Design an enzyme around this catalytic site. Sequence first.
Site, PDB file in Angstrom:
ATOM      1  N   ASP A 102       1.672  15.742  13.297  1.00 17.84           N
ATOM      2  CA  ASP A 102       1.927  15.368  11.903  1.00 17.84           C
ATOM      3  C   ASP A 102       0.694  15.482  11.010  1.00 17.84           C
ATOM      4  O   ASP A 102       0.487  14.650  10.126  1.00 17.84           O
ATOM      5  CB  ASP A 102       2.520  13.952  11.829  1.00 17.84           C
ATOM      6  CG  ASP A 102       3.369  13.733  10.570  1.00 17.84           C
ATOM      7  OD1 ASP A 102       3.824  14.725   9.965  1.00 17.84           O
ATOM      8  OD2 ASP A 102       3.577  12.562  10.191  1.00 17.84           O
ATOM      9  N   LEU A 139       0.830  -1.206   0.000  1.00 15.96           N
ATOM     10  CA  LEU A 139       0.000   0.000   0.000  1.00 15.96           C
ATOM     11  C   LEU A 139       0.864   1.255   0.000  1.00 15.96           C
ATOM     12  O   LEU A 139       0.482   2.278  -0.571  1.00 15.96           O
ATOM     13  CB  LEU A 139      -0.937   0.010   1.215  1.00 15.96           C
ATOM     14  CG  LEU A 139      -1.979  -1.110   1.265  1.00 15.96           C
ATOM     15  CD1 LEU A 139      -2.690  -1.150   2.612  1.00 15.96           C
ATOM     16  CD2 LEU A 139      -2.983  -0.966   0.131  1.00 15.96           C
ATOM     17  N   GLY A 140       2.022   1.174   0.647  1.00 13.28           N
ATOM     18  CA  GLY A 140       2.933   2.313   0.744  1.00 13.28           C
ATOM     19  C   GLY A 140       4.275   1.911   1.320  1.00 13.28           C
ATOM     20  O   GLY A 140       4.367   0.943   2.074  1.00 13.28           O
ATOM     21  N   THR A 197      11.334   5.318   3.905  1.00 17.42           N
ATOM     22  CA  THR A 197      12.556   5.002   4.645  1.00 17.42           C
ATOM     23  C   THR A 197      12.203   4.453   6.030  1.00 17.42           C
ATOM     24  O   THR A 197      12.956   3.662   6.602  1.00 17.42           O
ATOM     25  CB  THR A 197      13.477   6.240   4.772  1.00 17.42           C
ATOM     26  OG1 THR A 197      13.613   6.874   3.491  1.00 17.42           O
ATOM     27  CG2 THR A 197      14.859   5.837   5.279  1.00 17.42           C
ATOM     28  N   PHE A 198      11.048   4.883   6.546  1.00 20.34           N
ATOM     29  CA  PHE A 198      10.476   4.372   7.794  1.00 20.34           C
ATOM     30  C   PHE A 198      10.271   2.856   7.784  1.00 20.34           C
ATOM     31  O   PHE A 198      10.580   2.170   8.760  1.00 20.34           O
ATOM     32  CB  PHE A 198       9.131   5.077   8.094  1.00 20.34           C
ATOM     33  CG  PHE A 198       7.975   4.643   7.202  1.00 20.34           C
ATOM     34  CD1 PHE A 198       7.086   3.655   7.620  1.00 20.34           C
ATOM     35  CD2 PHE A 198       7.770   5.233   5.958  1.00 20.34           C
ATOM     36  CE1 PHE A 198       6.018   3.251   6.807  1.00 20.34           C
ATOM     37  CE2 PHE A 198       6.705   4.837   5.141  1.00 20.34           C
ATOM     38  CZ  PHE A 198       5.830   3.840   5.565  1.00 20.34           C
ATOM     39  N   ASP A 219      -0.929   7.129  11.082  1.00 16.51           N
ATOM     40  CA  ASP A 219       0.468   7.419  11.439  1.00 16.51           C
ATOM     41  C   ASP A 219       0.605   8.295  12.691  1.00 16.51           C
ATOM     42  O   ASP A 219       0.770   9.510  12.600  1.00 16.51           O
ATOM     43  CB  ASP A 219       1.230   8.022  10.253  1.00 16.51           C
ATOM     44  CG  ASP A 219       2.734   7.767  10.332  1.00 16.51           C
ATOM     45  OD1 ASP A 219       3.246   7.458  11.435  1.00 16.51           O
ATOM     46  OD2 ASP A 219       3.404   7.875   9.284  1.00 16.51           O
ATOM     47  N   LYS A 261      -1.186  16.214   8.021  1.00 16.43           N
ATOM     48  CA  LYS A 261      -0.933  16.454   6.603  1.00 16.43           C
ATOM     49  C   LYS A 261      -1.858  15.583   5.747  1.00 16.43           C
ATOM     50  O   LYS A 261      -2.462  14.635   6.249  1.00 16.43           O
ATOM     51  CB  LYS A 261       0.538  16.188   6.257  1.00 16.43           C
ATOM     52  CG  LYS A 261       1.054  14.819   6.641  1.00 16.43           C
ATOM     53  CD  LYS A 261       2.478  14.641   6.161  1.00 16.43           C
ATOM     54  CE  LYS A 261       3.084  13.347   6.653  1.00 16.43           C
ATOM     55  NZ  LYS A 261       4.474  13.178   6.138  1.00 16.43           N
ATOM     56  N   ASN A 281      -1.514  11.786   5.792  1.00 18.40           N
ATOM     57  CA  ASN A 281      -1.973  11.074   6.995  1.00 18.40           C
ATOM     58  C   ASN A 281      -3.482  11.142   7.209  1.00 18.40           C
ATOM     59  O   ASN A 281      -3.998  10.664   8.225  1.00 18.40           O
ATOM     60  CB  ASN A 281      -1.257  11.622   8.229  1.00 18.40           C
ATOM     61  CG  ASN A 281       0.227  11.305   8.231  1.00 18.40           C
ATOM     62  OD1 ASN A 281       0.704  10.497   7.430  1.00 18.40           O
ATOM     63  ND2 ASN A 281       0.964  11.937   9.136  1.00 18.40           N
ATOM     64  N   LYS A 340       1.531  -2.127   9.162  1.00 17.76           N
ATOM     65  CA  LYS A 340       2.730  -1.305   9.090  1.00 17.76           C
ATOM     66  C   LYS A 340       3.884  -2.107   9.688  1.00 17.76           C
ATOM     67  O   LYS A 340       3.833  -2.499  10.855  1.00 17.76           O
ATOM     68  CB  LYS A 340       2.505  -0.009   9.867  1.00 17.76           C
ATOM     69  CG  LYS A 340       3.548   1.067   9.690  1.00 17.76           C
ATOM     70  CD  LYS A 340       3.258   2.188  10.682  1.00 17.76           C
ATOM     71  CE  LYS A 340       4.092   3.412  10.426  1.00 17.76           C
ATOM     72  NZ  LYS A 340       3.819   4.460  11.443  1.00 17.76           N
TER      73      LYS A 340
HETATM   74  C1  LIG Z   1       0.261   3.181   3.492  1.00 16.67           C
HETATM   75  C2  LIG Z   1      -0.626   4.199   4.170  1.00 16.67           C
HETATM   76  N1  LIG Z   1      -0.774   3.959   5.618  1.00 16.67           N
HETATM   77  C3  LIG Z   1      -1.777   3.335   6.273  1.00 16.67           C
HETATM   78  C4  LIG Z   1      -2.978   2.692   5.628  1.00 16.67           C
HETATM   79  N2  LIG Z   1      -3.093   2.411   4.308  1.00 16.67           N
HETATM   80  O1  LIG Z   1      -4.400   1.792   4.270  1.00 16.67           O
HETATM   81  N3  LIG Z   1      -5.029   1.696   5.560  1.00 16.67           N
HETATM   82  C5  LIG Z   1      -4.086   2.249   6.340  1.00 16.67           C
HETATM   83  N4  LIG Z   1      -4.227   2.384   7.692  1.00 16.67           N
HETATM   84  N5  LIG Z   1      -1.628   3.290   7.617  1.00 16.67           N
HETATM   85  C6  LIG Z   1      -0.466   3.930   7.858  1.00 16.67           C
HETATM   86  C7  LIG Z   1       0.256   4.217   9.020  1.00 16.67           C
HETATM   87  C8  LIG Z   1      -0.163   3.905  10.199  1.00 16.67           C
HETATM   88  C9  LIG Z   1      -0.374   3.711  11.362  1.00 16.67           C
HETATM   89  C10 LIG Z   1      -0.769   3.681  12.788  1.00 16.67           C
HETATM   90  C11 LIG Z   1      -2.287   3.779  12.896  1.00 16.67           C
HETATM   91  C12 LIG Z   1      -0.271   2.386  13.415  1.00 16.67           C
HETATM   92  O2  LIG Z   1      -0.162   4.772  13.486  1.00 16.67           O
HETATM   93  N6  LIG Z   1       1.422   4.891   8.927  1.00 16.67           N
HETATM   94  C13 LIG Z   1       1.932   5.285   7.752  1.00 16.67           C
HETATM   95  C14 LIG Z   1       1.268   5.026   6.548  1.00 16.67           C
HETATM   96  O3  LIG Z   1       1.815   5.452   5.357  1.00 16.67           O
HETATM   97  C15 LIG Z   1       2.903   6.388   5.313  1.00 16.67           C
HETATM   98  C16 LIG Z   1       3.160   6.889   3.896  1.00 16.67           C
HETATM   99  C17 LIG Z   1       3.546   5.734   2.983  1.00 16.67           C
HETATM  100  C18 LIG Z   1       3.939   6.277   1.615  1.00 16.67           C
HETATM  101  C19 LIG Z   1       2.777   7.042   0.984  1.00 16.67           C
HETATM  102  N7  LIG Z   1       2.097   7.918   1.922  1.00 16.67           N
HETATM  103  C20 LIG Z   1       1.927   7.581   3.330  1.00 16.67           C
HETATM  104  C21 LIG Z   1       0.052   4.333   6.620  1.00 16.67           C
END
Ligand SMILES: CCn1c(-c2nonc2N)nc2c(C#CC(C)(C)O)ncc(OC[C@H]3CCCNC3)c21
Lengths: 324, 324
Positions: free
Chosen positions: B130, B13-14, B17-18, B148, B132, B135, B36
């Site tokens: 954070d 999904l994404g 570097t994290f 996030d 944005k 998020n 994650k």
């Molecule tokens: C990939 C996007 N993404 C998602 C989800 N994608 O679909 N359902 C999601 N939920 N959750 C997160 C969290 C998280 C968390 C907690 C709740 C544990 O704090 N942190 C980061 C994410 O991307 C970060 C970046 C990835 C690259 C593109 N844009 C966003 C998340």
Amino acid sequence: KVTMNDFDYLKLLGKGTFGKVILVREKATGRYYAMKILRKEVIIAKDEVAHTVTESRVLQNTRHPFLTALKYAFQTHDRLCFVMEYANGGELFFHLSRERVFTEERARFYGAEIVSALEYLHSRDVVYRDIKLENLMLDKDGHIKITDFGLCKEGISDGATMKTFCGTPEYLAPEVLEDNDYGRAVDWWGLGVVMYEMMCGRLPFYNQDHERLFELILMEEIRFPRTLSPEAKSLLAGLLKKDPKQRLGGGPSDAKEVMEHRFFLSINWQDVVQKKLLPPFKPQVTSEVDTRYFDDEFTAQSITITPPDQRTHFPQFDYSASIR
Amino acid sequence: KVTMNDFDYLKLLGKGTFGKVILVREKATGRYYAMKILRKEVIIAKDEVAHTVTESRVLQNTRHPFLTALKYAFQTHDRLCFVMEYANGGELFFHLSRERVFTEERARFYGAEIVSALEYLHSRDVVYRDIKLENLMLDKDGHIKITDFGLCKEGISDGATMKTFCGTPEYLAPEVLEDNDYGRAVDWWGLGVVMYEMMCGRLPFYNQDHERLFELILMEEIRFPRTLSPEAKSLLAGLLKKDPKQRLGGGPSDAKEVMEHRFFLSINWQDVVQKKLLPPFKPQVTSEVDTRYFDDEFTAQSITITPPDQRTHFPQFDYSASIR
Ligand SMILES: CCn1c(-c2nonc2N)nc2c(C#CC(C)(C)O)ncc(OC[C@H]3CCCNC3)c21
Ligand SMILES: CCn1c(-c2nonc2N)nc2c(C#CC(C)(C)O)ncc(OC[C@H]3CCCNC3)c21
């Protein structure tokens, strides 16, 4: 906290026994920088810890158009990394090796900018100690960027002295080749050597054997091409005066003596610092990753991590320009 | 004890570097979640241990319609895993990049839901830090789900301060770009930036170089499209006040100042939290594994395990929603 995997590692820009310098892309911004990477192991063995910490400390507070700006200083368990402005135009050494000689006009331009930087450093009681063509780079517009502050000394005001036998042999001032201490005038001698190279297309003194070289620096009379201007001959004679007390720039007014010299008659010094003087040569780079002004010797090489063999912490290596 | 092989790994999904986020299926139930996955090595090197532990600890106790709910937090010898609600509707960043601009009405809907969540978090002395578009995700019905929580700070009541220089550069409040400490008003600034983006189709401040960007955030006057409502201009001017003390939401009543603003004149805030407000946009997903609101750049990639190089235990990573 900044780490290694925050950057992409694109091309090797330069390498030596000190370590290596690499063109990197910062992942988060997509902006390009140079990164100097040093092994802690080598630094400790060589007894260069204080010098390397000083390199960071000076860069953290210096700000001047013709000094390389530090973005980050960070470290790992075995390495120290400086992230800094990428000087797209390469070293003056590169350009002089290709062009062989600069006109007096072009030398005057670079010389005025180096003098500006050295005035600024000396006003802040910093002696640079490593003026050479290899450490004089050009940004994308063709303005000077002094790099490699690894032999700087702080706290050196007018008349204060230093004792460390350091520098690059071909550029060492005669007083450094004597016992006891030396002063800030060594930087003006260094400007003397690079100005001489730019206008005469050779070092004023050279021998492959350092023992012969140092005898030449102490003892030999410099020569000039017959066609050099009287004031260029005067400028080089003054900067390369063997007695630091009699050297141009070696008095209490420091850079002012050099700035008031007849070779720089055409120069308005406030225009120099304000970057209003036009670079005679503009680097013809055509992208941000273009390394045409760096030697193939380095840029052809593939990037490779070296195998290694408790707190190994260095102070001054947790710096960011955004944070201080 | 929840483990890696308790899930099927379906789509990326994404990634950053994290670490990475993957669409997974829970084998036992056949229900779909997002996972994650972070490497402990990276988290430790980056000095983000406390932030990541906090991320779990906060999620364990928060419950609000517009905050992503955590199902499990667990860990392996070299990884930390968050299993959470899959936001089928993707990021607002995705939708705004497609549509370019939202109507003031649609911005108001999302804004109301974010304000509700921020009120809830602030009431529990949590600063999110954070805010944005990246998020701000949408569930299958089109309601906001903040994701996030890796930069949260607990124990921050009215007037309490924070010192960590963190966030996303383009969204950082002006006070964070000054020395010393900042307060919870940073979250309202963050709402300011996302509201501006939604209604004006660009960041209020941008430059690719952070040094230039931060100068803009500190110094530049925000501009508005001529067609914006007086109250939209007022809301944005208030949320993006550079002085946190004069900023909308920056007083002792916190979210109440924002809720009472004339831009939200049409909003009943009790209807907001009770999810009675109709989403203007409903994600047109047609199955539980549908990732049409996620960038191909990520979802096209294959799932791959990275090779690694005593107790490596992190606290707060033995959580299950069934158990507390
Ligand atoms: C990939 C996007 N993404 C998602 C989800 N994608 O679909 N359902 C999601 N939920 N959750 C997160 C969290 C998280 C968390 C907690 C709740 C544990 O704090 N942190 C980061 C994410 O991307 C970060 C970046 C990835 C690259 C593109 N844009 C966003 C998340
Ligand atoms: C590779 C050349 N080089 C460079 C740059 N190359 O492109 N932009 C640069 N900047 N920076 C340095 C520094 C430095 C420094 C600070 C500012 C942290 O003090 N030290 C040394 C360098 O080479 C030394 C040798 C490398 C081999 C060839 N000649 C020069 C640098």
